[PDB]
Each structure stands twice: as structure tokens, then as C-alpha cells.
């Protein structure tokens, strides 16, 4: 099996933990601890092939964390998750992208923009702006909703496919 070392990065409250738990256990958590950072391993079937996803839910605000930075350097793909009802998270997506670019020191890094909380009707970040940012960065954009578990699998599979394309 292929062990994909996925990472999930984003602002506070955007739903990284919710997305990871929806992928792993197929159930939504209404409230989760803000500062839980742990790696989840999942066995998935992509394109008819069995694969292993090792997903890190980065939720620690500490400046120095040896495990976190080692995982980030060894990571192969990044889910940049932001809440559509929060423009500040969308603005900080660029900061996270540049931080990841500096850490990896690579121009081509597999990243996928994720717009969480798609079920909420008070959308604040327009879909057009997010799509334009994604097409300017050259990376796919996927809308997910951890409460209804719509698009989470699609987003993770898109990240895996982008990783495979970058490897090949």
C-alpha cells in the first residue's frame, strides 16, 4: 500500500478537525477541542487501488514543534481549509500558502483549497473569488461541508490525485 502523508492546515474554527473526523469515522463532531493535534491513518480505495492516508490535523499555535515541522517537511500534500463564512480565514490562506512554500522550499507543492461550512447559508467569501485565487495558484478548489459530509471524500481524493500527478 502507498502511505500518503497528508497535512491539513487552516485558520481557527474552519473545520480541519471536523473534516478529518468525517473522513475517518464518518460522523460529524459539533464541538471539538481547538488544540488537538494528532495524526490519523485511514485505508481508502482510490481508482480501484488500496491506499493509506496519514493525515495531520495541525491545530497547535506553538511556534516550535519538532514533530509538526518534521511532518510538514515530510508531508506530500496540503489541504488549505477555510470557512466560507469567514473572510479572515480566506485572507490567511495566502499566509499559510507562503509559509508552506518557504518551509518546503519547493515551487510546485500539492495543495488543495477547501471551503468548509458549505451548508451555512450566510456565505461571506464569494465562490468566484475563491475560484479565481485557486486558478491563479494553479491548484483545485473543492467546497466541503463537514456537517453534511458532502465533498470531504472528493477533496481528499483530489489531493491524492494531485499528489500522484506531481510525483509522475
Amino acid at each position: 500500500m502507498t502511505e500518503y502523508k497528508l497535512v491539513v492546515v487552516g485558520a481557527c474554527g474552519v473545520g480541519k478537525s471536523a473534516l478529518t473526523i468525517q473522513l475517518i469515522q464518518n460522523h460529524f463532531v459539533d464541538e471539538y477541542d481547538p488544540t488537538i493535534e494528532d495524526s490519523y491513518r485511514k485505508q481508502v480505495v482510490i481508482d480501484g487501488e488500496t491506499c493509506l492516508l496519514d493525515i495531520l490535523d495541525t491545530a497547535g499555535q506553538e511556534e516550535y514543534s519538532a514533530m509538526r515541522d518534521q511532518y510538514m517537511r515530510t508531508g506530500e500534500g496540503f489541504l488549505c481549509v477555510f470557512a466560507i463564512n469567514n473572510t479572515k480565514s480566506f485572507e490567511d490562506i495566502h499566509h499559510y500558502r507562503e509559509q508552506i512554500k518557504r518551509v518546503k522550499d519547493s515551487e510546485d507543492v500539492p495543495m488543495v483549497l477547501v471551503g468548509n461550512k458549505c451548508d451555512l447559508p450566510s456565505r461571506t467569501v464569494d465562490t468566484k473569488q475563491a475560484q479565481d485565487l485557486a486558478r491563479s495558484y494553479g491548484i483545485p478548489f473543492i467546497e466541503t461541508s463537514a456537517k453534511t459530509r458532502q465533498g470531504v471524500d472528493d477533496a481528499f481524493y483530489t489531493l491524492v490525485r494531485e499528489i500522484r500527478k506531481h510525483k509522475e
Binding site: 469515522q25 464541538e31 477541542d33 488537538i36 495524526s39 491513518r41 514533530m67 518534521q70
Partner: protein, 157 residues
Amino acid sequence: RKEELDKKLLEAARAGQDDEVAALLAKGADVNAHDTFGFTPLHLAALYGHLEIVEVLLKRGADINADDSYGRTPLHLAAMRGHLEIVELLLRWGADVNAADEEGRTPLHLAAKRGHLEIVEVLLKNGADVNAQDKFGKTAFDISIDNGNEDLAEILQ
């Protein structure tokens, strides 16, 4: 009432207010109450580094072997947070050293993966299985090799 009191106890344990925790315990709160994911007040007290709250909960009758929806006991969280005093206190109260979560990760594995040498050696001193295998066939030595930490490999050997 009961749910609100339990939520207040959980919030007090998370924030780190010993006086509030004591007042809520004296008001009838449940030490074994779990939130949506399953974090008991002992889980949060061990995660956030509040030794006094951990001691008070243990004295009041908190389930030390309780696990959340992912099977992580408070010892797992205390090991992954690198709290030497908390892990020593939990082991002193008979916590399941070789407990397994949904992935079968021993607290030794979590301590090794995070990079906490002191937690690793303390767990080993209290009978931690070095040869323990998770559901994905990885031991503490394999985690040390993957991380590449020479000190962790030396300690595990």
C-alpha cells in the same frame, strides 16, 4: 440542568480554574461526563497541563481508563502533550499503560512520535511494551526510525 452542569465542569477543566472545578464538583457534577467527541474532564485536565485538576478529578472518582470516540485515554493525551508530572500521576493511579486507541497506538508510540524522551523513558520504566504493534504494523522503534531521532532510538534500545 445535568447537561449544563457537566458542560460547565468540562469548560472549567479545560480553562484551568481549580476553584471553579471544585465548586462544580461540590454542586453535583459528574466526573465521567463526556462531550460530543468523548473528552471527559480528566481528558481535558491532562491535555491542558492542569495537574491539580487531574488530582482533584482522580480523588473525586474520575474514570482514569475512560476513552473518547477515538479510544484515546487521558494517558494518551498526557503523553502526547509531554507532561511528565501528569503521566507520572496517571501511572501512579493504575492507568492502562498498554492501552490501545482506534489505531492501536500505545501511549509509548504517541510519546515517541511527538518526540518526548522523558515521557518515553517514564512509560518504559512502568512496563511499556516496546514490541507493541498498532493496527498498521508499526512499533515504537519503527516510529523512531521514521522520525530519525538518534536519542529516541538510543532510549528505545
